[PDB]
């Protein structure tokens, strides 16, 4: 029931095209509001609110600190990038694709084809449905990209359809860990 | 392309501190404050990199000191509670008698304080459960994962109970075969 008081700081390193373009951000929060901020595109602290003006001015008076922050894109961002490059930037985990039917309403027939794509990394994924070699773009609902919190992702891409005997449905998956599209078929 | 975040916070009066490293939404490691030891999200990370926990403990002292300054300068304005959004799901499709893992995703909340309890048929579970620290978001809020490895059966139902100061009643998200 007592009041809470939170101090929260983030030091962000943003990488584009490997380490060719690197951006460094420092952010200071109290409770829910950002007050001070260092942006490598500026090279100085700036006040986000009037509450953070004393810290920005005082910090901008310390030349030794501004030089540390201005060099972070190299001494901090690019350094830490190379430390874990082998098991983060280059981490690759193949997807596990399975198809199984389901039902929109318990008392109705199987009118829902689920394409489960789980256990992959990174989060990038593209899934497509096909009826008899033609792509089905209408009637597709999905959970979206689900982060499992353990360096793996999953997603369900479902197709609302009435399967007819003889028809073949194909779930096609594209992921940076595989070269050619991955296909799984389901026959009625 | 890629983002690396170093997130640290200190909370009063709970006196809770955290220091962690993020890579595109995932945890590389966090510094255990009591043990003063670098905990890697995946054991294999420790074999490829390192980090001296003393740097984190040093930052947490500064953050603790800055909190006192900002609490005074802000005239002791308390934080506004933001209740969490809770989701329960499984690591993979569910096959009977085939091991799996229930995942409770607590999302979009502040301050970073939550009690999370796994319930099997209403009874608490305190064996086999694991949990991550508070993870950063793009919008100054926090998220958190809890895990319950289980053997799927038709006789067992599960509930993830979450309690947050921004919640009137504790949240219960359900899951069953």
């Amino acid at each position: 029931t007592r009041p809470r008081f939170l101090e929260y700081s983030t030091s962000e390193c943003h990488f584009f095209n490997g380490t060719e373009r690197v951006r460094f951000l420092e952010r200071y929060f109290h409770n829910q509001e950002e007050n001070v901020r260092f942006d490598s595109d500026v090279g100085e602290y700036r006040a986000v609110t009037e509450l953070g003006r004393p810290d920005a001015e005082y910090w901008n008076s310390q030349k030794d600190l501004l030089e540390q922050r201005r060099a972070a894109v190299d001494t901090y961002c690019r350094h830490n990038y190379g430390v874990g490059e082998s098991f983060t930037v280059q981490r690759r985990v193949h997807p596990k694709v399975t198809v199984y039917p389901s039902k929109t309403q318990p008392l109705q027939h199987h009118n829902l084809l689920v394409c489960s794509v789980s256990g992959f990394y990174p989060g990038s994924i593209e899934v497509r449905w096909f009826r008899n070699g033609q792509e089905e773009k209408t009637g597709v609902v999905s959970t979206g990209l689900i982060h499992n919190g353990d360096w793996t992702f999953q997603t369900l891409v479902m197709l609302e359809t009435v399967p007819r005997s003889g028809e073949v449905y194909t779930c096609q998956v594209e992921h940076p860990s595989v070269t050619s599209p991955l296909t799984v078929e389901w026959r009625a | 392309e890629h983002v690396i975040i170093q997130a640290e916070f200190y909370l009063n009066p709970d006196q809770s501190g955290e220091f962690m490293f993020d890579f595109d939404g995932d945890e590389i490691f966090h510094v255990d404050m009591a043990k003063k030891e670098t905990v890697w999200r995946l054991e294999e990370f420790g074999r490829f990199a390192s980090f001296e926990a003393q740097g984190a403990l040093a930052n947490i002292a500064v953050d603790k000191a800055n909190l006192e300054i900002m609490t005074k300068r802000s005239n002791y304005t308390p934080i506004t509670n933001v209740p969490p959004e809770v989701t329960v799901l499984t690591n993979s499709p569910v096959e009977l008698r085939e091991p799996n893992v229930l995942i409770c995703f607590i999302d979009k909340f502040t301050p970073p304080v939550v009690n999370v309890t796994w319930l099997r048929n209403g009874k608490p579970v305190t064996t086999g459960v694991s949990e991550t620290v508070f993870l950063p978001r793009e919008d100054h809020l926090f998220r958190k994962f809890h895990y319950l490895p289980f053997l799927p059966s038709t006789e067992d139902v599960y509930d993830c109970r979450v309690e947050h100061w921004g919640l009137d009643e504790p949240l219960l998200k359900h899951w069953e075969f």
Binding site: S9, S11, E26, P54, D55, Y58, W59, L65, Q68, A72, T75, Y76, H79, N80, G82, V83, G84 | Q6, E8, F19, F21, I28, F29, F48, A49, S50, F51, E52, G55, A56, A58, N59, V62, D63, A65, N66, I69, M70
Partner: peptide
């Protein structure tokens, strides 16, 4: 291979 912490700066 060793990670580096940014250092926290004391506020006014």
């Amino acid at each position: 291979g060793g990670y580096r912490a940014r250092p926290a700066k004391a506020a006014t």
